């Protein structure tokens, strides 16, 4: 089963994909998802990307506690006391983000679906 | 708090509103919803309608085991052994529907938002 796997899943209210973990098969093609930011939803398998980490060269969207978000490309990974960090490059310069600070726009998520979707 | 209150809330993957209960305030303007069909989601207050029953003269969408679904107008309520029934009128005639047989289209729900919305 997929219980326990890290995934990147669509929040159906805004079309973005967010990191979290599957916590149960609840049927009707859905899985209970505990997102990394604390909220839960029963999400369709079609909207789940079974993809950890998000692959190098993937076009993504980066967040911040203090500044507004934008699009760049994944260029690095790093694991530290069990937690994942990403290195994304926008317009030349590169910078680092926590796992929760990285998400996928609708368009960005759809690109990974053929290879990583549970539907 | 709103814990335990019956509501009608938007399921964002298809845009329809369905009956259920708020089960916890999870902060960030969201509420955990146990929908009457068993599925949960942490939903924004703006997508929750605090109205039980659905008021008279409300345009709704009525479900049926034997015919395709369509819009009608609430013209009655009835309580029996602890269960709510709606009297919906389409094209003149009226009929009774269990609570789970009544949902709102996206626009039908958006109409009640100003008066019954938690946001």
């Amino acid at each position: 089963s997929f219980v326990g796997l890290r995934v990147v899943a669509k929040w159906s209210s805004n079309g973005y994909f967010y990191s979290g973990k599957i916590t149960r098969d609840v049927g009707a093609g859905k899985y209970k998802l505990l997102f990394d930011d604390g909220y839960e939803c029963d999400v369709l398998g079609k909207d789940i990307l079974l993809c950890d980490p998000i692959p190098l060269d993937t076009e993504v969207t980066a967040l911040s506690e203090d500044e507004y978000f934008s699009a760049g490309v994944v260029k690095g990974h790093r694991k530290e006391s069990g937690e994942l960090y990403y290195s994304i490059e926008k317009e030349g310069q590169r910078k680092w983000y926590k796992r929760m600070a990285v998400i996928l726009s609708l368009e960005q998520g759809n690109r990974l679906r053929e290879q990583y979707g549970l539907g | 708090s709103f814990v335990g209150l019956r509501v009608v809330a938007k399921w964002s993957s298809n845009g329809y509103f369905y009956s259920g209960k708020i089960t916890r305030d999870v902060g960030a303007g969201k509420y955990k919803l146990l929908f009457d069909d068993g599925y949960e989601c942490d939903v924004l207050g703006k997508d929750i309608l605090l109205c039980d029953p659905i008021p008279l003269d409300t345009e709704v969408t009525a479900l049926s085991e034997d015919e395709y679904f369509s819009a009608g107008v609430v013209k009655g309520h009835r309580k029996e052994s602890g269960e709510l029934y709606y009297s919906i009128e389409k094209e003149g005639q009226r009929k009774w529907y269990k609570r789970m047989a009544v949902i709102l289209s996206l626009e039908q729900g958006n109409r009640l938002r100003e008066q019954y919305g938690l946001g």
Partner: peptide
């Protein structure tokens, strides 16, 4: 954190 509305 900054994010699209949710």
């Amino acid at each position: 954190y900054i994010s699209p509305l949710k």
